[PDB]
UniProtKB/Swiss-Prot annotation, chain B:
Regulated by guanine nucleotide exchange factors (GEFs) which promote the exchange of bound GDP for free GTP. Regulated by GTPase activating proteins (GAPs) which increase the GTP hydrolysis activity. Inhibited by GDP dissociation inhibitors (GDIs). Its EC number is 3.6.5.2. It catalyses: GTP + H2O = GDP + phosphate + H(+). It is a lipid-anchor. It comes from Homo sapiens. Switch 1, switch 2 and the interswitch regions are characteristic of Rab GTPases and mediate the interactions with Rab downstream effectors. The switch regions undergo conformational changes upon nucleotide binding which drive interaction with specific sets of effector proteins, with most effectors only binding to GTP-bound Rab. Phosphorylation of Ser-66 in the switch II region by LRRK2 prevents the association of RAB regulatory proteins, including CHM, CHML and RAB GDP dissociation inhibitors GDI1 and GDI2. It is an enzyme of class 3 (hydrolase). Binds EEA1. Interacts with RIN2 and RIN3, which probably regulate its pathway, possibly by acting as GEFs. Interacts with GDI1, GDI2, CHML and CHM; phosphorylation at Ser-66 disrupts this interaction. Belongs to the small GTPase superfamily. Rab family. Its cofactor is Mg(2+). The small GTPases Rab are key regulators of intracellular membrane trafficking, from the formation of transport vesicles to their fusion with membranes. Rabs cycle between an inactive GDP-bound form and an active GTP-bound form that is able to recruit to membranes different sets of downstream effectors directly responsible for vesicle formation, movement, tethering and fusion. The modification Phosphoserine is found at S66. This is Ras-related protein Rab-5B.
Length: 163, 165
């Protein structure tokens, strides 16, 4: 079993907490408090890769916390909301921050969350894909609400990590 | 440069959480008044860069550990209070330190306050047990008196110095 630390980043309300709860606990409850209720949570994927997952919900404003959150992190997911263009712009700022401040070996994924609300889409799939490709990022659209692509994002990260 | 943070107070009922908050925020103490800060939260600052605290009291809510998600969400600091005249309160402070370490952001700054230190002629919690305990858990520690204001401002100052700039 390989075990790694993974951090979730992104604007408040994009779905960071929901994504971690869906992956770790299997479930979703709408309008819950925006937190994972735990200092960190753990879950695995079999190829076995075990993730210790740190959420930044409630802490998004505090970029000087970066040293602590990124120390010993092997992976990160930057999350945006596909219905909110500003959150995609914001995601780029965190991708940049990871690139400048996290370990040079960190595996970064971008998640376009709330893809169940594709009718209210404001960030084009092809736009985020090009951006992800330009930055050597993993990219998927996700829905914590339905579970669409949630486990599979963590699996894609697991495959990119060292053995 | 005003950094503003959220701070939560934990500890057994009657240790002095509400008194400590009112002393820092309003400057004053009134003995035997209701165990509440009379506000959803209160704000006060410390100048170093000015650090502003939005302070949540748990007085009246101590039983309900299931509220922790809401209280700890977006919190950057916490103070766990005990009463230096009451050993069970110190034993209890350890339970809340453990709850914060398990359930709050890993980045949270945690302080330990031995309150009612003005009643040193009724002391039952050894300062050295408390200090050793604080050291083992990477906590800030001071004894305080909401009643006289001894060390109350300086406790929040010490927390402010440890928080991110
Ligand atoms: N429709 C939809 N709502 C979601 C999704 N993920 C999260 N939410 C909701 O969006 C709000 C914010 O989610 P939350 O996980 O707390 O975001 P966080 O602040 O980034 O941790 C809550 O009401 C969630 O239930 C999703 O994939 N689809
Ligand atoms: N002697 C003394 N009494 C205090 C001190 N702090 C609080 N008290 C008193 O202890 C009682 C409980 O305090 P309170 O602040 O309501 O505790 P809380 O339930 O933790 O909010 C009240 O009668 C306070 O006036 C202190 O530093 N010294």
């Amino acid at each position: 079993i390989c075990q790694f630390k993974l951090v979730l980043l992104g604007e408040s309300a994009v779905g960071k907490s929901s994504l971690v709860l869906r992956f770790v606990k299997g479930q979703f409850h709408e309008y819950q408090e925006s937190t994972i209720g735990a200092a960190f949570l753990t879950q695995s994927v079999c190829l076995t890769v075990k993730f210790e997952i740190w959420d930044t919900a409630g802490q998004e404003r505090y970029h000087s916390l970066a040293p602590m959150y990124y120390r010993g992190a092997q992976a990160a997911i930057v999350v945006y909301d596909i219905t909110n263009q500003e959150t995609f712009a914001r995601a780029k700022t965190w991708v940049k921050e990871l690139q400048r401040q996290a370990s040079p070996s960190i595996v970064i994924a971008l998640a376009g969350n709330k893809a169940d609300l594709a009718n209210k889409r404001m960030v084009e799939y092809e736009e985020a894909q090009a951006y992800a490709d330009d930055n050597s990022l993993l990219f998927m659209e996700t829905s914590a609400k339905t579970a669409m692509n949630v486990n599979d994002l963590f699996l894609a990260i697991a495959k990119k990590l060292p053995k």
